[PDB]
Amino acid sequence: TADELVFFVNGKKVVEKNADPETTLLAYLRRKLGLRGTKLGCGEGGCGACTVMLSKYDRLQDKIIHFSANACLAPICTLHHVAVTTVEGIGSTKTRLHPVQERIAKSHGSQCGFCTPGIVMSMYTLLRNQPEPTVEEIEDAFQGNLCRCTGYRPILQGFRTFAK
Amino acid sequence: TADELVFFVNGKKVVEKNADPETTLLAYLRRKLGLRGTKLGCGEGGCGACTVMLSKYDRLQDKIIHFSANACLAPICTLHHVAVTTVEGIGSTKTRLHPVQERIAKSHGSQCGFCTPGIVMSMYTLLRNQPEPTVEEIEDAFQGNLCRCTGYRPILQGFRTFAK
Amino acid sequence: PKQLRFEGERVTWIQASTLKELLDLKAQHPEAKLVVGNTEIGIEMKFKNQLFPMIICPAWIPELNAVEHGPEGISFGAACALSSVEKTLLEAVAKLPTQKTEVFRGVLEQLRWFAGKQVKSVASLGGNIITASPISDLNPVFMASGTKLTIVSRGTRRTVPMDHTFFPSYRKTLLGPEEILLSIEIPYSREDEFFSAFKQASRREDDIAKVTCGMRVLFQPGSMQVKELALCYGGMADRTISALKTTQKQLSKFWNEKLLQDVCAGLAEELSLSPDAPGGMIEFRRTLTLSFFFKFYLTVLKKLG
Amino acid sequence: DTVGRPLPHLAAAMQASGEAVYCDDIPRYENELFLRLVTSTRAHAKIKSIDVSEAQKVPGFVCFLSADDIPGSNETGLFNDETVFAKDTVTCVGHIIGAVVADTPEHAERAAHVVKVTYEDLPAIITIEDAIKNNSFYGSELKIEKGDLKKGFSEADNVVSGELYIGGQDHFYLETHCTIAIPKGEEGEMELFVSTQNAMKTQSFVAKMLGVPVNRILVRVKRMGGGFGGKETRSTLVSVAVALAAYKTGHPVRCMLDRNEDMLITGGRHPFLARYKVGFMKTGTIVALEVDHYSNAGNSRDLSHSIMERALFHMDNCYKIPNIRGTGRLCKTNLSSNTAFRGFGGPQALFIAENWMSEVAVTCGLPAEEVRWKNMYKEGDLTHFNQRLEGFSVPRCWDECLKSSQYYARKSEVDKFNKENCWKKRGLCIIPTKFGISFTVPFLNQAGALIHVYTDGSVLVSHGGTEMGQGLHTKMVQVASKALKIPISKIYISETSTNTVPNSSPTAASVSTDIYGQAVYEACQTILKRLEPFKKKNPDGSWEDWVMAAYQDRVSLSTTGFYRTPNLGYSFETNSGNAFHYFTYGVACSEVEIDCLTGDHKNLRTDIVMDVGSSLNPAIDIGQVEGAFVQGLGLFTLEELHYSPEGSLHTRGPSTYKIPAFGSIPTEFRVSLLRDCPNKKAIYASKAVGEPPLFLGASVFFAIKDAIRAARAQHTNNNTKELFRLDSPATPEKIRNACVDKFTTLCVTGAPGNC
Amino acid sequence: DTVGRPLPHLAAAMQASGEAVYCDDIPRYENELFLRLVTSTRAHAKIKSID
Amino acid sequence: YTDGSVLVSHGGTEMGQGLHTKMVQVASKALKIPISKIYISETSTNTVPNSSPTAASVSTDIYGQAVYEACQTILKRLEPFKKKNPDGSWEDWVMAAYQDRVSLSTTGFYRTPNLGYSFETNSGNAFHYFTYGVACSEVEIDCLTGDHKNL
Ligand SMILES: Cc1cc2nc3c(=O)[nH]c(=O)nc-3n(C[C@H](O)[C@H](O)[C@H](O)COP(=O)(O)OP(=O)(O)OC[C@H]3O[C@@H](n4cnc5c(N)ncnc54)[C@H](O)[C@@H]3O)c2cc1C
Ligand SMILES: Nc1nc2c(c(=O)[nH]1)N[C@H]1C(S)=C(S)[C@@H](COP(=O)(O)O)O[C@H]1N2
Ligand SMILES: O=c1[nH]c(=O)c2nccnc2[nH]1
Ligand SMILES: O=c1[nH]c(=O)c2nccnc2[nH]1
Ligand code: MOS
Ligand code: MOS
Ligand code: FES
Ligand code: FES
């Protein structure tokens, strides 16, 4: 005798009738839902390759709140009545890229590209909280995202255009 | 609340706790058991591409009886306590070929090779009932087995080597 | 919000809707593990291969998520995310007099280069405090400031200032087996009261040997004569520790060069490390403890001077 | 025609959208299983037993695989000194012993952890000093020796000598090792999908283990999320194990390593210990130099030998040294085997060099840029392995970098700051580099291509190189389009596979664009020659017109292309014959501020000028300048690997091992490509950019060492000609410890001492 | 040199054993779907609707 | 490959007629190596493009010529090493040619000569050659049923 876990991913309702307490969101996304845009880099919260946006009603603030999180650490069992947005939630070369995706691509902010969905989701999240951030706000958004390829310069530069 | 279906394939117990009366042994073997040497050529009993051997204990004869059958038409629901043998139960190039498999190959009895497992199981089933059969019996073995490629002569010739 | 129960291959998970439910559940299964952000328990389960058969998530409980302004300080529920703690403190700092926000500003300095946004958005206050890592960056600050801890079990409630006795041994706190941290009030600083917090910018072993500190002086009114002094350090032992021998010696002494020499002599001895202490970096760690105090000394003189 | 144009990485937009597929992003077969490796917890031990009782009870457990399950051979590795699975003895902590197969990777993890291995410890050797003491080496000493050392040491005003250690490095490719093996079921056939830079040795090694011909094994490599040399060889440790599980079960099997397994198992950059002795004039002119290099090679040979060779090739950096001896010894230790890492022994030898160079300047009391400039090769000069330097463009990079960095003016701002500030200091350093282009093994300097043109005019290029983010495929496409005279949108590269281009060299040594570029180019030339008659009869026709006519005339629209690098073959007996085809050059200027009380530092500004000949893609190439530079800043300043006494790696993820982050990069980060210098050795006059700019991150290291000399002048003594050992990485610990003052000595306390 | 010799078909042994993989014998991906054509029952006709 | 094993790929597909068996026999003969060193896995658009269907009975003719050509190319390349080492094995010449940065991979191609019939003018060859045969059969019919046996 056990409850159903109900949550949303890129706007679609997920009802999981047999949630295992030990299931992380990254494992569910990739291996149950088939959305492999979100990556495993470390499994320990350091690199942000598994970065998603989460949205929930904060029954206190009023407010739907939007924030980022590491999917490799997020138990799906915390996520009852929570909304997840992944890289595929924001746009695609099949329909239209999100402006975040287009800019990091055209600015040479992407090499191997493994770190890129994470950074796109940290940048996407900032924009949902602050559609006119400062340059300082843009840099600190990525405190939790690592890139081994680019030396970071081109990423910040492409995104400065979102500032003011 | 519904009963378990218990048969055997290639000596291995299958326990199907949820048998659909509509499931054929051909579909179950290929699509549930992962055993694809038994083939679909018609779904109506005329080509024998799907030929398997079945064995049951006869309560009366004592005797375990062996016969051939078209897996495309055999409901798995009729197979309770029946033992199935397919082309992969009798030999393989990874272990050792059964004489039948070796003979049809070396006689040039196999061109595209699609009818070959079913022909093998027809011949294997004959030999399992009559270890030294007649040339007459050899041929009637293959009444419900079609081959589009060979013109049949090499199959029969390669297999005559079992009479005498 | 109704309580939810999930069951896996090895683990039972209970999503508590209500404070009363949590305290009943913890009374029945005092060995049950709470999980809020999982930024610590997910590491233990994955990497240290701990199994916790019974998990209670108390994240939905208002209280535990409340932010309360009082006359002594700003109180945060234990399930509050470090991002919210951070947002509320920054707001307090921009709005109040410098002299009331001395402690809020060392909390903020420790949060500065702490993980990243993903971690801070889900890591709770309480999880940090009760994890009691030797290298927690917040525990030294809560200790040096006497941050008050409201602690509750089914039919008990107590509020205790954090002090050196809160951490008896490696990764243990002075909570009985049925108590939960409810809330944490981070104090305004008073007249004649100055606070600094510092950290080593190298971690190299999973939970040891990264120097981190909260430092607090309160002077007699209008003076440079010490009334209270607290210097607390992570990364110098298997727990957060306070240099109490050293600081007791400075009571009623004056903020000067001899005070500087006496504290540093006091520290070199009281926090001294075996040539074989876990973590290595024996001389660097000794030098940081003294060097972080020098910085505090010079800063305090500037807030005076 | 897009060559020379800043065209973004072809896959960039799909990478940003999460649509770009990496090995583990590949959907699973309904029957696909998961492998987890079982690995030594001991540095050197005999295996007494393995008990899998408890692992057998984990839901979904399939099997435990060990050395005895192997049909072909248990003998593996580039030099045949490794096991696939350790048999009787383990010889490092990540040493592969077996593998667990299960139905989920969660179940494979859970089962592997509960496998009981019983051991009996054996005397271990971990450090370079453990190994020298025990003469535990691979092979015999290697050497370049030109001139008379006892005699250069005798015309010499000053002789300085010392020891220097440089720490290793983890590749930290964002995507860890990953293989999928699909057993076909017929004839031994198996198709593998792998994050590897070396699909040929993956193919050979799997076939060898299985005891089947190479022609049975297809390896396909679409992309890696990073390689950095760490996937040039050690990928086979995963690939071979997963192939064996595929063989044994007859099901598809995958494994992607978790970060902590990856850092333990698959090795990294070699730690080097150097002992050096330099002789020089009061002038700073170098007269003799002797260096003995010791690399920590770990528990198998791998690529260690040729790493040591490239090191000795780079021991001069950019400096004419008339008398010179440099040896190299490969230490055999109980650690994970170390491997290729961007620069490939180059950054280490080149660091050792700027180190003694920095001392020469200090000893002579002269300005660093002067002692470096004075000692620089001149265009035409011979190196110590006797190769000539043609198009030696360092002096240009140098003068331009000094000017564009405003070096002389900033060196004064720096001295002004050091006078005004007691507890923080600033450092400034301008450092040159040259890096030799070619595999050091002549037979790896070969490359294939295979081009088809389809009857719509669409073109599929296949070459032997792999995409790991460097934009190889992008550059191959810009070339093919240039050479065929059609837009890039008509051309496509899908993947790398052993069935389209056989016998490929790893994608390594920074030469892929040169050698696949040539292969591709030649295949395009063959195709254009086949098309000439149709161009002739229809001069206004379109490419599609000529293709259809060629096809209807039964002219073949598919060809191989190939390239060998000419006139290569250096000798170690004889000390002669070209080691390299050419050299890439650059200069970097960096400025830092150190906090002398904490050991923290800020990277304030860096200016790089790099000679990359005529750039195929200025955007890709600048991007490589930047990323290589930032990875060398990691090596020299941040990245520190740390082991227990008994040989076990403590630093096994991002919380304990620190690669550069967003906020680690210089506040002002400026990179220029040297204009107007056509390179005639390589495709369309371009130069290898991959590994060359990495050692330029050492300019941050030497600016920090400069900041420290300024802190020691302040608090420790009055000797401005002092020499102090600063090892690499210059971590906060090393920096703080070096700024000797009232705190490091005791005080101030009042305590005598110092200082 | 086997040119001119009665060499058996290279795959015949595997065809006899049921190991030779024909197109439908290829394993399915976990998410693999199946298609069934919808076909005219009239020799010549306008399609007026499909429900 | 460097173990001396050969992978052959050609335009033609296997449908039971033993095409791959006959390309293996041709390539072995052309290379002068045992058939057991040569393998053909399958036919694909990324190895041989723009292929004709395997049809008109000509697959052995035209592929066997394409295979032969490419085998000749390999022999020409392996020649210098065979000369340098007359007494060694196939594997020795192959490894030798690899270390010497000789390419062990090539395409072949073949275009049937002198074809091209005109329906206006009624000239030019339609065919390359003709295959011929004769059969004699005996049958017995049942006049009362319409049945028959082929004797
Ligand atoms: C990448 C990364 C970087 C980090 N960097 C730092 C850093 O720089 N400095 C630092 O100090 N920390 C750091 N941390 C630690 C982090 O701040 C703590 O992991 C986190 O705050 C724990 O909170 P949580 O909600 O995630 O705890 P959980 O993992 O959910 O729980 C942790 C522990 O607290 C208990 N618990 C939770 N709430 C209560 C309660 N109300 N009463 C009693 N027990 C409770 C649980 O039982 C468990 O034992 C880092 C972690 C990560 C992943
Ligand atoms: N983004 C990215 N850039 C990279 C690497 C990588 O793995 N990812 N590898 C480096 C190394 S070690 C080398 S030699 C080259 C390899 O390819 P090239 O030969 O085309 O430059 O890329 C360099 N730049
Ligand atoms: O096997 C290798 N041999 C080499 O000589 C070499 N040189 C540079 C980079 N990788 C290399 N790899
Ligand atoms: O276009 C074709 N012309 C032919 O003669 C032919 N012959 C046999 C099979 N397909 C064929 N196709
Ligand atoms: O030679 Mo760059 O791949 S290691
Ligand atoms: O020519 Mo056979 O395909 S009609
Ligand atoms: S995978 Fe690295 S933080 Fe989640
Ligand atoms: S692009 Fe490779 S890690 Fe960022």
Ligand code: FES
């Ligand atoms: S498939 Fe033809 S008889 Fe069963």
Ligand code: FES
């Ligand atoms: S061999 Fe083709 S149908 Fe019998």
Ligand SMILES: [Ca+2]
């Ligand atoms: Ca190396």
